[model samples]
Target chain A: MSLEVFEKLEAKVQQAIDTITLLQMEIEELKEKNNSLSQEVQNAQHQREELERENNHLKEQQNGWQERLQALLGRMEE
Target chain B: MSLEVFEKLEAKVQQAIDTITLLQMEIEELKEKNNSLSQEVQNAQHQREELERENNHLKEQQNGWQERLQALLGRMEE
Candidate 1:
């Protein structure tokens, strides 16, 4: 009876060790995926900034053209 | 031997089911929060656009007034 109890105890210990090992591996995988997603988010932000700059430049140019057209019409009327 | 192994596996299976259930609940909560935050961000974006439009209108008014004032000053100098 003592030997059977010792054997079961040893088996449970081994099972606990296996569970810890699997959890650690899963954690490492999750960390790596998190880092990759973080990098992607930063890149998306950079892209957004670039697009915003382009939009602003285009808007400025459009405003300039509108002002020039107004001035041209004013001179013609005069 | 067979009975003991089955008993150990049954305990492990129960643990696995509990873990799955916990993960499912956590995922559901996270998804709901994510949706809520997404809508908030959209509202913020709309507010931002409204402010930007107002800012652009003010800037145009300012530029027009400045140009008119400068033209008047030029005529005075002549």
Candidate 2:
């Protein structure tokens, strides 16, 4: 009976090792996922900056057009 | 000698349980980290969408300005 107890413990130990193996694998996968998310954030940051730059330039161009148009009649060959 | 072998196995079994306990804790930490990364990715998605919307609007506005300008000198019927 005592040896049977030890046998049960041996089985439990095997089960524990199995669980650890799976957990270790999960951690690696999670780390990969975390890295992927970080990259995504970095990419979004780059894209956002680009968009803001384009938007600012467009606003400037529109103001330039307005400036030219507002000074139009004054320069006309009247 | 046979029971003694079982005794050694028992010690290893105890060690395995300890390792497994730590593994379980580590898994929880990894899962939490993964969830954090997921939230970060979601935040980036929202910001990306907003930036994209602003960019499209600016382009459309620039086009509207051009359309108005192009129809200008022709409308000043001489």
Candidate 3:
């Protein structure tokens, strides 16, 4: 009876160890994926900021040209 | 003797279940984070597209103004 008890306990411990090992691997994979995804998010945000800044520059150029044209038109009227 | 054996088996099973529960929760949290990160990437991409389109429009307007200014200068010179 004691031998049977030892055998059953050993089997349960082994099964537990196996489960822990698998979970550890899965957790590591998830963490790596999460890190890469975070980096991608940061990159995307940086690209958006750059595009916005460029758009603002284009807007300013348009404004400058419009003002010049208006001044010219005023001179013609005078 | 049999009672002790049954109790030991029950404890081992309970411990395994507890570990499984914790792992399940962790996996769920990781999945949620991954999903939100994916959504953020998509939004950033969409914003980039919109900004690019607006930039193109501004360039077109700037070109129109430049051409008009040139024509006005030519007329003034003549």
Candidate 4:
């Protein structure tokens, strides 16, 4: 092959390699973004769970207080 | 003009176009999924806020009952 033809072939191969490298970089960036979003979702879920537990505890306390208040009110009405 | 060169150029352009279209479709699908997930997050946030407010109200009511009980006990002791 002539030197010119060889140079042309090498250029095509280099172009293909560059395209592949670009694609790989894009994929890695997308994966990192996905991981960051997943962590955000997990943190929100954890916070929601913590709030639910707190709500349940508050409800229990409210029920106990309601019972006492009702008994006192009943005694006053008697 | 070389028919072979024209064919090769056409093939590369077609390949590049196909890759771009596929990426576009993938981005559209990701956008839709992201929207759905965002709505879910918003709903969870609203529910968390609601629970927090109700819990706070219940706590206040519990404190009020305790104060009433304390006053009654103090009067009885006097």
Q: Can you list each candidate's DockQ? A: 0.01, 0.02, 0.01, 0.01
Best by lDDT: 3
CAPRI-style quality class for the chain A–B interface of candidate 1: incorrect
* Model 1 TM-score, all chains together: 0.46
TM-score, candidate 1, first chain: 0.82
What tens-digit string does per-residue lDDT give for candidate 3 at B1-78?
Answer: 376665665565555455445545554554555556567898755655554565456455545555554554454344
- Give candidate 4's chain B TM-score: 0.77
Can you write out model 1's per-residue Cα lDDT over B19-68, one digit (the tens) per residue? 44554555455455555555555554555555455555645555554555
Kept native contacts, as fractions per model, are 0.00, 0.04, 0.02, 0.02
lDDT of 2 by residue, A1-78 (tens): 476665655565555455445544554555555566568998655655554555555455555545454444234322
Error of 2 at B78 (Å): 99
* DockQ metric, candidate 2: 0.02
User: Model 2 clash pairs?
Assistant: none
**lDDT (C-alpha) at residue B40 in model 2:** 68
Q: Any residue pairs clashing in model 4, and if so which?
A: none
lDDT of 4 by residue, B1-78 (tens): 377755655565555455445544554554555556567777655655554565455455545545555554444344
lDDT by residue (tens digit), candidate 1, A1-78: 366665655565555455445545554554555555555555545555554555455455555545555554454344
- After superposition, the stretches of candidate 2 with alpha carbons farther than 4 Å from their true spots are A1-3, A73-78, B1-78
User: What is the lDDT, from 0 to 100, of the residue A6 in candidate 4?
Assistant: 61
Candidate 2 chain B: minimum summed lDDT over ten consecutive residues — where? B69-78
Instruction: Tell me the tens digit of each residue's lDDT in model 4 across A1-78.
Output: 577766665665555455445544554554555555556667766665665565455455545545554554444344
Clash pairs, candidate 3, are: none
Model 1 score (lDDT):
0.53
